[PDB]
Protein backbone atom coordinates (compact mmCIF):
# COMPACT_ATOMS: atom_id res chain seq x y z
CA UNK A 1 0.00 0.00 0.00
CA UNK A 2 2.80 2.43 0.84
CA UNK A 3 4.82 1.44 -2.23
CA UNK A 4 1.73 1.75 -4.41
CA UNK A 5 1.15 5.26 -3.04
CA UNK A 6 4.46 6.51 -4.44
CA UNK A 7 4.76 9.61 -6.63
CA UNK A 8 7.35 11.14 -8.94
CA UNK A 9 7.45 14.37 -6.95
CA UNK A 10 8.78 17.59 -8.45
CA UNK A 11 8.31 16.64 -12.10
CA UNK A 12 5.44 19.12 -12.60
CA UNK A 13 5.39 22.60 -11.07
CA UNK A 14 2.75 25.32 -11.39
CA UNK A 15 4.08 28.89 -11.57
CA UNK A 16 2.49 32.34 -11.81
CA UNK A 17 3.72 35.20 -13.99
CA UNK A 18 1.79 38.46 -14.46
CA UNK A 19 -1.46 36.78 -13.37
CA UNK A 20 -0.88 34.00 -15.93
CA UNK A 21 -0.60 30.40 -14.73
CA UNK A 22 1.94 28.22 -16.56
CA UNK A 23 2.24 24.48 -15.86
CA UNK A 24 6.01 24.30 -16.25
CA UNK A 25 8.02 21.08 -16.05
CA UNK A 26 11.70 20.37 -15.47
CA UNK A 27 11.94 17.79 -18.28
CA UNK A 28 10.51 17.54 -21.79
CA UNK A 29 9.26 13.97 -21.33
CA UNK A 30 6.36 15.20 -19.20
CA UNK A 31 4.93 17.01 -22.23
CA UNK A 32 3.94 13.70 -23.81
CA UNK A 33 2.07 12.93 -20.56
CA UNK A 34 0.28 16.29 -20.09
CA UNK A 35 -0.34 17.74 -23.56
CA UNK A 36 -1.83 14.39 -24.63
CA UNK A 37 -4.01 14.19 -21.51
CA UNK A 38 -7.73 14.01 -22.22
CA UNK A 39 -8.81 16.62 -19.66
CA UNK A 40 -6.10 19.21 -20.31
CA UNK A 41 -6.88 21.22 -23.43
CA UNK A 42 12.09 23.91 -18.89
CA UNK A 43 8.84 23.70 -20.87
CA UNK A 44 5.49 25.23 -19.93
CA UNK A 45 2.07 25.81 -21.48
CA UNK A 46 -0.76 28.22 -20.74
CA UNK A 47 -3.86 27.39 -18.70
CA UNK A 48 -6.97 29.41 -17.91
CA UNK A 49 -7.11 30.97 -14.46
CA UNK A 50 -10.46 29.41 -13.55
CA UNK A 51 -9.57 25.95 -14.91
CA UNK A 52 -6.72 25.48 -12.40
CA UNK A 53 -9.04 23.48 -10.14
CA UNK A 54 -9.53 20.94 -12.95
CA UNK A 55 -5.89 20.32 -13.88
CA UNK A 56 -4.81 20.08 -10.23
CA UNK A 57 -7.47 17.46 -9.49
CA UNK A 58 -6.60 15.66 -12.73
CA UNK A 59 -2.93 15.82 -11.71
CA UNK A 60 -3.92 13.83 -8.61
CA UNK A 61 -5.19 10.95 -10.78
CA UNK A 62 -2.43 10.78 -13.43
CA UNK A 63 0.15 10.04 -10.70
CA UNK A 64 1.78 13.51 -10.90
CA UNK A 65 0.70 15.46 -7.78
CA UNK A 66 1.75 19.01 -8.61
CA UNK A 67 3.56 21.05 -5.96
CA UNK A 68 3.08 24.77 -5.30
CA UNK A 69 6.43 26.07 -4.04
CA UNK A 70 7.62 29.68 -4.07
CA UNK A 71 11.20 30.95 -4.37
CA UNK A 72 10.56 34.19 -2.52
CA UNK A 73 14.32 34.58 -2.03
CA UNK A 74 14.91 34.64 -5.80
CA UNK A 75 11.68 36.50 -6.69
CA UNK A 76 12.41 40.14 -7.52
CA UNK A 77 9.54 40.98 -9.88
CA UNK A 78 7.03 41.27 -7.04
CA UNK A 79 7.65 44.35 -4.86
CA UNK A 80 9.14 43.19 -1.58
CA UNK A 81 7.67 44.18 1.79
CA UNK A 82 10.01 44.98 4.70
CA UNK A 83 8.28 43.64 7.82
CA UNK A 84 9.97 41.68 10.60
CA UNK A 85 8.95 40.32 13.99
CA UNK A 86 9.84 42.83 16.68
CA UNK A 87 12.30 41.78 19.41
CA UNK A 88 9.51 41.54 22.00
CA UNK A 89 8.14 38.45 20.24
CA UNK A 90 8.85 34.95 21.58
CA UNK A 91 7.89 32.19 19.13
CA UNK A 92 6.84 29.07 21.02
CA UNK A 93 8.44 25.70 20.19
CA UNK A 94 5.47 24.16 18.36
CA UNK A 95 5.08 27.33 16.29
CA UNK A 96 8.68 26.97 15.10
CA UNK A 97 8.09 23.29 14.29
CA UNK A 98 4.99 24.17 12.26
CA UNK A 99 6.93 26.78 10.27
CA UNK A 100 9.92 24.46 9.75
CA UNK A 101 7.69 21.92 8.01
CA UNK A 102 6.71 24.74 5.62
CA UNK A 103 10.05 26.51 5.04
CA UNK A 104 12.24 23.46 5.65
CA UNK A 105 13.81 23.46 2.18
CA UNK A 106 13.84 27.27 1.89
CA UNK A 107 10.85 27.51 -0.46
CA UNK A 108 7.43 28.47 0.89
CA UNK A 109 5.39 25.26 0.91
CA UNK A 110 1.65 25.54 0.34
CA UNK A 111 -0.27 23.45 2.84
CA UNK A 112 -2.30 23.32 6.03
CA UNK A 113 -1.07 23.78 9.60
CA UNK A 114 -3.27 22.33 12.35
CA UNK A 115 -2.90 23.52 15.94
CA UNK A 116 -5.29 23.39 18.92
CA UNK A 117 -7.67 26.32 19.40
CA UNK A 118 -5.79 29.16 21.07
CA UNK A 119 -2.36 27.73 20.21
CA UNK A 120 -1.40 30.90 18.33
CA UNK A 121 -2.19 30.18 14.69
CA UNK A 122 -2.44 33.93 14.09
CA UNK A 123 1.20 34.36 15.09
CA UNK A 124 2.13 31.44 12.83
CA UNK A 125 0.63 33.31 9.89
CA UNK A 126 2.32 36.54 10.97
CA UNK A 127 5.69 34.79 11.14
CA UNK A 128 5.14 33.18 7.73
CA UNK A 129 4.24 36.57 6.25
CA UNK A 130 7.14 38.28 8.03
CA UNK A 131 9.74 35.81 6.73
CA UNK A 132 8.37 35.74 3.17
CA UNK A 133 8.57 39.56 3.00
CA UNK A 134 6.00 40.07 0.26
CA UNK A 135 2.49 41.45 -0.14
CA UNK A 136 0.05 39.25 1.77
CA UNK A 137 -3.73 38.82 1.86
CA UNK A 138 -5.72 37.27 4.71
CA UNK A 139 -9.22 35.78 4.57
CA UNK A 140 -11.15 35.05 7.77
CA UNK A 141 -14.72 33.86 8.25
CA UNK A 142 -16.06 36.91 10.11
CA UNK A 143 -15.71 40.67 10.48
CA UNK A 144 -14.81 40.54 14.19
CA UNK A 145 -12.03 38.07 13.39
CA UNK A 146 -10.81 40.33 10.58
CA UNK A 147 -10.39 43.16 13.08
CA UNK A 148 -8.52 41.01 15.60
CA UNK A 149 -6.05 40.08 12.87
CA UNK A 150 -5.28 43.76 12.31
CA UNK A 151 -4.89 44.43 16.03
Amino acid sequence: FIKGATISYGKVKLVIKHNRYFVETTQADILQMLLNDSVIGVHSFEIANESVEVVKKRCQEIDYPVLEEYDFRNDHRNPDLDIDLKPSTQIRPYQEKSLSKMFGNGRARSGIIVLPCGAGKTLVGITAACTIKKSVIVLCTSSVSVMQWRQ
Binding site: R73, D84, E96, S100, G104, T127
Partner: protein, 111 residues
Protein backbone atom coordinates in the same frame (compact mmCIF):
# COMPACT_ATOMS: atom_id res chain seq x y z
CA UNK B 1 59.75 37.21 -4.73
CA UNK B 2 61.52 36.65 -8.06
CA UNK B 3 64.99 37.23 -6.53
CA UNK B 4 64.30 34.75 -3.72
CA UNK B 5 63.54 31.82 -6.03
CA UNK B 6 66.63 32.64 -8.14
CA UNK B 7 69.19 33.44 -5.43
CA UNK B 8 68.47 30.28 -3.41
CA UNK B 9 68.28 26.74 -4.77
CA UNK B 10 66.20 24.90 -2.15
CA UNK B 11 63.10 26.63 -0.76
CA UNK B 12 60.49 25.02 1.51
CA UNK B 13 57.02 26.60 1.50
CA UNK B 14 55.27 25.01 4.48
CA UNK B 15 51.97 26.02 6.06
CA UNK B 16 49.18 24.17 7.83
CA UNK B 17 46.39 25.91 5.89
CA UNK B 18 47.82 26.21 2.37
CA UNK B 19 45.17 25.05 -0.10
CA UNK B 20 44.84 24.77 -3.03
CA UNK B 21 48.57 24.09 -3.45
CA UNK B 22 48.57 24.73 -7.22
CA UNK B 23 47.43 28.37 -7.03
CA UNK B 24 50.69 29.58 -5.45
CA UNK B 25 52.95 28.43 -8.31
CA UNK B 26 50.44 30.15 -10.60
CA UNK B 27 50.32 33.34 -8.50
CA UNK B 28 54.06 33.32 -7.78
CA UNK B 29 56.11 32.22 -10.78
CA UNK B 30 58.00 29.23 -9.38
CA UNK B 31 58.03 25.46 -9.83
CA UNK B 32 58.10 22.77 -7.16
CA UNK B 33 59.75 19.35 -7.15
CA UNK B 34 56.93 17.95 -5.00
CA UNK B 35 53.79 19.33 -3.38
CA UNK B 36 51.47 17.34 -1.12
CA UNK B 37 49.18 17.61 1.90
CA UNK B 38 49.10 15.18 4.82
CA UNK B 39 46.03 13.68 6.48
CA UNK B 40 46.41 13.27 10.24
CA UNK B 41 46.08 9.66 11.42
CA UNK B 42 44.07 10.41 14.55
CA UNK B 43 42.36 7.58 16.43
CA UNK B 44 39.31 9.54 17.62
CA UNK B 45 38.14 12.72 15.90
CA UNK B 46 39.61 15.69 17.76
CA UNK B 47 37.94 18.57 15.86
CA UNK B 48 34.27 18.76 14.85
CA UNK B 49 34.07 21.07 11.81
CA UNK B 50 30.55 22.26 11.03
CA UNK B 51 28.74 24.68 8.72
CA UNK B 52 25.68 26.62 9.90
CA UNK B 53 23.56 27.89 7.01
CA UNK B 54 20.45 29.02 8.90
CA UNK B 55 19.34 30.02 12.38
CA UNK B 56 16.95 28.36 14.79
CA UNK B 57 14.03 29.85 12.83
CA UNK B 58 15.41 28.26 9.62
CA UNK B 59 16.11 31.72 8.16
CA UNK B 60 19.34 32.01 6.20
CA UNK B 61 22.27 33.96 7.65
CA UNK B 62 25.05 35.65 5.70
CA UNK B 63 27.66 38.34 6.36
CA UNK B 64 26.99 40.36 3.20
CA UNK B 65 27.98 43.96 3.91
CA UNK B 66 24.80 45.20 2.21
CA UNK B 67 22.54 43.64 4.87
CA UNK B 68 24.77 43.98 7.93
CA UNK B 69 22.10 46.12 9.63
CA UNK B 70 19.45 43.41 9.39
CA UNK B 71 17.38 42.49 12.49
CA UNK B 72 17.19 38.84 11.34
CA UNK B 73 20.85 38.14 10.58
CA UNK B 74 22.02 40.11 13.62
CA UNK B 75 19.60 38.29 15.92
CA UNK B 76 20.42 34.85 14.49
CA UNK B 77 24.16 35.42 14.89
CA UNK B 78 23.63 36.78 18.40
CA UNK B 79 21.53 33.78 19.41
CA UNK B 80 24.20 31.45 18.03
CA UNK B 81 26.84 33.37 19.99
CA UNK B 82 24.91 32.99 23.25
CA UNK B 83 24.08 29.32 22.68
CA UNK B 84 27.72 28.41 22.00
CA UNK B 85 28.79 30.47 25.03
CA UNK B 86 26.55 28.33 27.25
CA UNK B 87 28.25 25.00 26.49
CA UNK B 88 31.84 26.06 25.73
CA UNK B 89 33.81 25.29 28.92
CA UNK B 90 36.81 27.63 28.84
CA UNK B 91 37.42 29.72 25.72
CA UNK B 92 35.49 30.82 22.66
CA UNK B 93 36.99 32.92 19.85
CA UNK B 94 34.84 34.65 17.23
CA UNK B 95 36.27 35.86 13.91
CA UNK B 96 34.50 38.56 11.89
CA UNK B 97 35.07 39.37 8.20
CA UNK B 98 35.92 43.04 8.74
CA UNK B 99 36.43 45.39 11.67
CA UNK B 100 33.53 47.62 10.60
CA UNK B 101 31.21 44.61 10.52
CA UNK B 102 32.22 43.75 14.09
CA UNK B 103 31.52 47.30 15.27
CA UNK B 104 28.07 47.56 13.67
CA UNK B 105 26.91 44.08 14.69
CA UNK B 106 28.24 44.41 18.25
CA UNK B 107 26.45 47.74 18.68
CA UNK B 108 23.21 46.13 17.51
CA UNK B 109 23.77 43.25 19.95
CA UNK B 110 24.13 45.67 22.86
CA UNK B 111 20.89 47.46 21.97
Amino acid sequence: IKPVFERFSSVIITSGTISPLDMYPRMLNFKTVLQKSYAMTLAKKSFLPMIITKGSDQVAISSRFEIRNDPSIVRNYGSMLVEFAKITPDGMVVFFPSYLYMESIVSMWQT
